Design a protein around this ligand. Structure first.
Ligand SMILES: CCc1oc2ccccc2c1C(=O)c1cc(Br)c(O)c(Br)c1
Length: 469
C-alpha cells in the first residue's frame, strides 16, 4: 500500500492540513480531560456558622469562636459560640479563585470527599470502555465515521455534564464523554498513521503528543478566562460541534477501505487525497493476544512494556488530574505542564536516536519518578521548588510516554506489533483508572499518594532496563 501512498504523495498539503485539524481536535480533547482540576477544584470551605452568616466582633474573632481549629477545621463547628458538631447547615466556600465548582455545588467535601477522585476515575473508566468498544467499531465501521460520531458524542455529553443537575448525572455524562474521547483518540491516531508514509510515523506520533502538550496550555487559558464550572465545561465541549461538522472533510482511511473490500470507495478517497491510477492498479496492489502471550520469548518484553504503559497512565493521570497538591498556582502549573512537555518530548525524540532507546526510556521514567519523590520530600513552604519539581516530573512522564510509544513497536515482530501496542494502551488506561483512586490514601497523609506516584514510575523505569535494545 505504501506504493499507493507514494503515488498520491504520502506527505504533503493534505497530510499537513489533516494533521493540523486533528491536532486542534486533540488539543480540545486534552482540555476536556484536564478540565477536571479547574471545574472540580476544591475551594477553601468551612461549616456554615450562624454567627458568621447571620440568620461588635471582628470577622477573625467570629471565625475563631465559631469554627474549631483544624490541621480552621473545614467540616466542624462549635455547637455554641465560644461541643463541636458537623456542618449541620452546610458549607461556605471560598470563591475568590473559582466562582463555582462541582465540589462547591454537590458538597463533595469530607464525608463525601472520595466522590471527587471517584468521579474522575469514572471518567477514566469510560475511556477504557470506549477503547474496548470503539476499537472494533473502527475496524467494522469507517474510522472517520467513528471519529465523527465520537466528536458528536463528546460535544453532547460535555454540554449535558455542564448542565448536570445532580452528581450521578454528572458522573454518567462524564463517563459518556470519556467513552467518546477514547474513540476520538484512537481514530485520530489510526487516521494519522494510515495516511502518512511509514518513514514519518514517529514524526506524526510526536505531533500527536504535542497536541496534548498544547492542550495543557489551552486548558489553562480557557480556565483563566472562565471561572464557572458550568460555563467552563460548556466552552470546552462546544468546539466539538465544529469538530463533528468539519470531520466530514477528513479523508477516510484508504487502507481500511481497500482491505475491507471497498475498492471503488477507497479509489475515490485516494484520488481525492492525491488531488489535494485505475481500479486495476489498486486491485493488483491490494495476531491475537493469545499468540503474543503464549510465545515464551516475548513474556519478559511483553510484561515490561505493559508495565511501562501502566506506569505512564497511572502516574500521569494521578498527578496531572490533581495539580493543587503539586503546587500553589493551578493555572501556572497547568501552563507549565505543556511548556515543559514540549521541550521534554522533543528531547526524548532526540535522545531516542543518539543516546539509545532503552536508556532514554529508563532515564525518563527514573527522572520522572525521582522528581515526584523529591517533590513530596522537600518542605511544603518551599513552594516554588515543589512546583518546579512537579512540572519536571510531569515532563519526564510525558517524555517516557513518547519513548514507550516509539519503542514498544520495535520490541515485537511486525505481526504481534499491533497486539502489543493495544495491550500497552489498555494497560495505560487501566493505570489511569487507578490513578485518581490512590488519592484516597491522602487521608493517611498527603505524602502517600505522591509516594505511590513516584515509586510506580521509578520501578517501571528500573524494569525497563531489562528490555532487549
Ligand atoms: C500524550 C499522553 C497524554 O497526554 C494527555 C493530556 C490530557 C488527556 C489525555 C493525555 C494523554 C493520553 O491519555 C494518551 C494515552 C495513549 Br495509550 C496514547 O496513545 C496517546 Br497519543 C495519548
Amino acid at each position: 500500500f505504501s506504493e499507493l501512498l507514494d503515488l498520491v504523495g504520502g506527505l504533503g498539503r493534505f497530510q499537513v492540513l489533516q494533521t493540523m485539524a486533528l491536532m486542534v481536535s486533540i488539543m480540545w480533547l486534552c482540555t476536556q480531560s484536564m478540565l477536571e482540576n479547574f471545574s472540580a477544584a476544591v475551594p477553601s470551605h468551612r461549616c456554615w456558622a450562624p454567627l458568621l452568616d447571620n440568620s461588635s466582633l471582628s470577622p477573625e474573632a467570629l471565625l475563631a469562636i465559631s469554627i474549631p481549629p483544624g490541621p480552621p477545621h473545614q467540616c466542624r463547628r462549635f455547637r455554641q459560640p465560644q461541643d463541636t458538631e458537623p456542618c449541620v447547615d452546610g458549607w461556605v466556600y471560598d470563591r475568590s479563585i473559582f466562582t463555582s465548582t462541582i465540589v462547591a455545588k454537590w458538597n463533595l467535601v469530607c464525608d463525601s470527599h472520595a466522590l471527587k477522585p471517584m468521579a474522575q476515575s469514572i471518567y477514566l473508566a469510560g475511556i477504557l470502555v470506549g477503547a474496548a468498544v470503539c476499537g472494533p467499531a473502527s475496524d467494522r465501521f469507517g474510522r472517520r465515521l467513528v471519529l465523527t460520531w465520537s466528536y458528536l458524542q463528546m460535544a453532547v455529553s460535555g454540554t449535558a455534564a455542564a448542565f448536570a443537575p445532580t452528581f450521578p448525572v454528572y458522573c454518567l455524562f462524564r463517563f459518556l464523554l470519556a467513552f467518546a474521547v477514547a474513540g476520538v483518540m484512537m481514530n485520530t491516531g489510526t487516521l494519522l498513521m494510515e495516511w502518512t508514509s511509514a518513514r514519518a510515523r514517529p514524526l506524526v506520533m510526536t505531533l500527536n503528543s504535542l497536541g496534548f502538550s498544547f492542550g495543557h496550555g489551552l486548558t489553562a487559558a480557557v480556565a483563566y478566562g472562565v471561572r464557572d464550572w458550568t460555563l467552563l465545561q460548556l466552552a470546552v465541549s462546544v468546539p466539538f460541534f465544529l469538530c463533528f461538522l468539519y470531520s466530514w472533510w477528513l479523508a477516510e482511511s484508504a487502507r481500511w477501505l481497500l482491505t475491507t473490500g471497498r475498492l471503488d470507495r477507497g479509489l475515490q478517497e485516494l484520488r481525492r487525497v492525491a488531488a489535494i491510477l485505475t481500479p486495476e492498479v489498486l486491485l493488483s496492489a491490494m495476531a491475537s493476544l493469545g499468540t503474543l502471550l503464549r510465545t515464551p520469548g516475548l513474556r519478559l518484553r511483553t510484561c515490561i512494556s505493559t508495565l511501562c504503559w501502566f506506569a505512564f497512565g497511572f502516574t500521569f493521570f494521578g498527578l496531572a488530574l490533581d495539580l493543587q497538591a503539586l503546587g500553589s498556582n493551578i493555572f501556572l502549573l497547568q501552563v507549565l505542564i505543556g511548556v515543559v512537555d514540549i521541550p521534554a518530548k522533543m528531547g526524548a525524540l532526540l535522545l531516542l536516536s543518539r543516546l539509545g532507546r532503552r536508556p532514554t526510556l529508563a532515564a525518563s521514567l527514573l527522572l520522572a519518578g525521582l522528581c515526584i519523590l523529591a517533590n513530596t520530600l522537600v518542605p511544603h513552604e518551599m513552594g516554588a521548588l515543589r512546583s518546579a519539581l512537579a512540572v519536571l516530573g510531569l515532563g519526564g512522564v510525558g517524555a517516557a510516554f513518547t519513548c514507550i510509544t516509539i519503542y514498544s513497536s520495535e520490541l515485537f515482530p511486525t505481526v504481534l506489533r499491533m497486539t502489543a501496542v493495544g495491550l500497552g494502551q489498555m494497560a495505560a488506561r487501566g493505570g489511569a483508572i487507578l490513578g485518581p483512586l490512590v488519592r484516597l490514601l491522602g487521608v493517611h497523609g498527603p505524602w502517600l499518594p505522591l509516594l505511590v506516584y513516584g515509586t510506580v514510575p521509578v520501578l517501571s523505569g528500573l524494569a525497563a532496563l531489562l528490555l532487549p535494545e
